Every structure is written in C-alpha cells, then in structure tokens.
C-alpha cells in the first residue's frame, strides 16, 4: 500500500535575543540510511524580516514554506504593502497547518524575527497548527538531544546561585549574538556526534532591524 | 493535562497546568491552557493542543459576532453550545477536546459548562478534565465547601493542580489561576511547580511521601 509520507531527517534550532533572533538548521537531507544532499537548505528568508523552517517530511516542508511565502505576497497586495508582523505570520501559519488537519503536513515548523517592539521572537508549531512563542526551541530529528541543553544554557534551568543553599535561582538575562552563535554551533556539533541524520553543514540565519544575515559552518560528514 | 473549575460563594475559580506532551516527550512546560474569550468568559483546554487552541479561538470570534449582531454579550449557555454543536458535526472524525466554558452573565450568574469532543455538554458546579483529573478531584472534593473564601478557594484550586502535577506524569510545568466574579475574570498569576511544590511542602507539612 502506498505511503504518502517520508522522513528527510535533519534538525533545526531557534533562539531569540533582546534585539535579534537566530534560526539555524543543518544542510543534510536523507532517506533511510542514504544521504540525498550534503547541502540542501531548509531555513528560508520569507520577507518582512521573517525566517522560517519546516522540518520533517521535506515535500510537506517545501509546500508549506511555498504557501506561506505566497501568503506574505498576497498580504501586501490586499493590505497596502503593510508589513506582516511575526505574531500575524504565526496565526496565519496555524490556519495553513490546521487546514490539513485530516491529512497533515508532516513537519515541525519554527519561525523567527522581531516583534512589534523590536525584540527578538521565536514561534514554534506542531504538525497540525498548535503554536506558542518562546525564547528557545529545537525541532526535528535531534530535537530531543538539543532542547534540554537549551533549557539549561538559555533559560538557566536547574542552575542556582552558588552558596545560596539552592534557594536563589540564576537570574534570567538576554544573550549577545556572539554567545547565541556559540550555543548554536556547540548544539549542532553535539547533535552531529550522536545522531546519524545530522551533519554535513550548518546554516544560521540571523535577524536584526538591519535585515537578514547568513553564516555557514562545516559539520562532520560521516 | 489537568484542568479544573468550580463554583462557590464568591464566584468561580479556574485552575490549569501548563504541560504539553508527545508520548513520553515533554514538549512544553509553558502552554497557555486558559483562553480569554472576553472580559467575562474563559475557556479551558485539554486533549489535542491544536484542536483546543484552534476551535476555542474560533469560538471567541463567534462570541464577538454575537455581541455585534445582538448588541449584548453572549450567554455562557449559548457560547458553550456553539462549541458543542461544532464538535458534534465533526463527531467520528477524530477531534480530541475536553473543555470547560466558564463565565458570568446577569441572567445566568456564575456558570460552568463541560464540553467534549464526543458531543457531551453538561452544566455543573465542579469539573476536573484531563489525564490528571482524578488526582485533582481527590484533593478538590475532599476540601470543597460552598462557603470557601476567595483566598481559600484560590489556594484549593492551586493545590489541586499541584497534586495532579505531582502524581500525573503528563501534568506539570506551572499553575495558572483565574477568579471569575460579577465584574469579570481576574488573573491570579503563573506559579511554577519547581518552587511551588517545596513552598507548599514546607508551609503545609504535606507531601511526606517525598524525600525532604
């Protein structure tokens, strides 16, 4: 019997700072135990300072990104070139996903950008459109490896102030773009070590008020 | 999930946890399971995250259209029935929802309706919904009186979620409290179980099963 779904592997990661946000993802694409491509990007600039990635089944991922990019285009046509805010994009993506509730897009979606106060924003979705804004989210095959590391290093979970008898928590603070990229690179090298579907290359898209910048780093190719 | 809402002398208390799970994987500890429909109406979420979130925000839009058309805030009965009739149309298609529509109007007073995805709609004073509902019932039922003060009622709702958060593996994160009066709903904060458990243990002397 024909199975309309597949698994293209890979993993993605979004972190938000005070005046910026990053959305990273490895460039490997797989089926079963074979590599399809060592460089097939899945993090995209969708316009209006919104970056997006839909990781899982690549065909569904591409279809969704394609439809959202198109949604941004028609938002301009219908509402006098108004900028689509990250919160409005998030709600729009929910309806794209839930529209196929009974034949779902097999993807974990993450978008990143700046909110209307200029502060960094990351939104994450389940396959059928449930969404939530967070400081931090990892998605895809190695999400279970990376996410707990992010809880510990971004949100300072389980970390207390030394000498305070485990009474005072380590205070929350925004991270610099330099510190965030360090965590992204370490997260992906760790995930590459212990997950077979993750490797080859890392592509990070950084979003500030000035625009979208890209950075690329090599990952292990085994 | 564990969600509850109960009626009492001073209105309605609504309390929920904040955990989302995909099998045994803890997906989120910060989910908003109460939706603020209007200043006098609340909705609780249990079951499918997307199903609940999507259709309860849709419900909010239907309630807004009612007050535009009828120049009057929708009743709790009518609001709950819009949702129950909606899910009944989808019966068998596989929607998963356990919701509670809580609010105040002049004609009804404080009112709670239980609505679920197989079409059940029930008016009642006390309900607990979710995988940890039984744990919440155990504490809530054994301490409930109609004559509870606003202060005590808030604590009991908080304490009942904490009980379920502790025992139910698929409940946890933090407690979100709400109080519904004749003047509308009032938010009573987000309470992390990480700190709340130890604070309650020490001050109350309960949770003796746990290594102190």
């Amino acid at each position: 019997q024909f199975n309309p779904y597949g698994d293209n592997g890979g993993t993605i990661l979004g972190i938000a700072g005070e005046d910026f946000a990053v959305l990273a993802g490895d460039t490997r694409n797989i089926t079963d135990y074979s590599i399809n491509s060592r460089y097939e990007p899945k993090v995209f600039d969708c316009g209006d300072n919104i970056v997006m990635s839909a990781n899982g089944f690549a065909a569904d991922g591409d279809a969704l990104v394609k439809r959202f990019k198109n949604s941004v285009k028609w938002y301009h046509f219908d509402h006098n070139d108004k900028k689509l805010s990250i919160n409005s994009a998030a709600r729009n993506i929910q309806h794209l996903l839930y529209g196929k509730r009974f034949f779902p897009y097999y993807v974990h979606t993450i978008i990143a950008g700046l909110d209307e106060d200029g502060k960094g924003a990351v939104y994450s979705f389940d396959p059928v459109g449930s969404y939530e804004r967070e400081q931090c989210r990892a998605g895809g095959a190695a999400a279970s490896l990376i996410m707990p590391f992010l809880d510990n290093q971004v949100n300072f979970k389980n970390q207390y102030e030394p000498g305070t008898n485990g009474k005072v928590k380590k205070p929350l603070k925004y991270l610099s773009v330099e510190e965030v990229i360090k965590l992204v690179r370490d997260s992906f090298t760790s995930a590459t070590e212990r997950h077979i579907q993750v490797g080859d290359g890392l592509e990070i898209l950084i979003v500030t008020k000035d625009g979208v910048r890209k950075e690329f780093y090599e990952l292990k190719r085994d | 999930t564990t969600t509850l809402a109960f009626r009492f002398q001073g209105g309605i208390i609504v309390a929920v946890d904040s955990r989302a799970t995909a099998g045994n994987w803890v997906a989120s500890q910060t989910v908003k399971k109460v939706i603020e429909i209007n200043p006098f109406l609340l909705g609780t979420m249990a079951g499918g995250a997307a199903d609940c979130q999507f259709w309860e925000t849709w419900l909010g839009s239907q309630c807004r259209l009612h007050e535009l058309r009828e120049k009057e805030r929708i009743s709790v009965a009518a609001a709950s029935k819009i949702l129950s009739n909606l899910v009944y149309q989808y019966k068998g298609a596989g929607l998963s929802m356990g919701t509670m529509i809580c609010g105040y109007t002049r004609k009804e007073g404080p009112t709670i309706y239980y609505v679920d995805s197989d079409g059940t709609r029930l008016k009642g004073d006390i309900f607990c919904v979710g995988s940890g509902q039984t744990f919440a019932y155990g504490v809530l039922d054994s301490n409930y009186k109609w004559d509870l003060s606003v202060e005590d009622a808030l604590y009991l709702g908080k304490r009942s979620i904490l009980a379920a958060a502790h025992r139910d593996a698929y409940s946890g994160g933090s407690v979100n409290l709400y109080h519904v009066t004749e003047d509308g709903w009032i938010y009573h904060g987000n309470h992390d179980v990480g700190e709340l458990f130890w604070k309650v243990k020490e001050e109350e002397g309960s949770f003796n099963n746990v290594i102190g």
Binding site: P104 | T1, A27, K33, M45, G47, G48
Partner: peptide, 4 residues
C-alpha cells in the same frame, strides 16, 4: 502532535 502534542496533547495536554
């Protein structure tokens, strides 16, 4: 997809 997650449940609650």
């Amino acid at each position: 997809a997650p449940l609650x």
